[PDB]
Ligand binder design. Structure first.
Ligand SMILES: C[As](C)(=O)[O-]
Ligand SMILES: [Zn+2]
Ligand SMILES: [Zn+2]
Length: 74
């Protein structure tokens, strides 16, 4: 299970790139969020993630979908 500390850190790193504070980021900023967490995904691995959290291809990711995908990755 994710810990409270993991959820809080995932939230904080995401929020660094949510400039308008509405709980969404662009798919182009997902790698920057992951690197902010000290991870180093490949472009490949980023594409697979974007495939899970931006199924419709609108180029946005909300925090709930980011968090469950990370739960699955961790
Ligand atoms: C009003 As908007 C598309 O910048 O969240
Ligand atoms: Zn917005
Ligand atoms: Zn959503």
């Amino acid at each position: 299970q994710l810990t409270e500390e993991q959820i809080a850190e995932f939230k904080e790193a995401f929020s660094l790139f949510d400039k308008d504070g509405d709980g969404t980021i662009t798919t182009k900023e997902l790698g920057t969020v992951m690197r902010s967490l000290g991870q180093n995904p490949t472009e490949a691995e980023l594409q697979d993630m974007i495939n899970e959290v931006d199924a419709d291809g609108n180029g946005t990711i909300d925090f709930p979908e980011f968090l469950t995908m990370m739960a699955r990755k961790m």
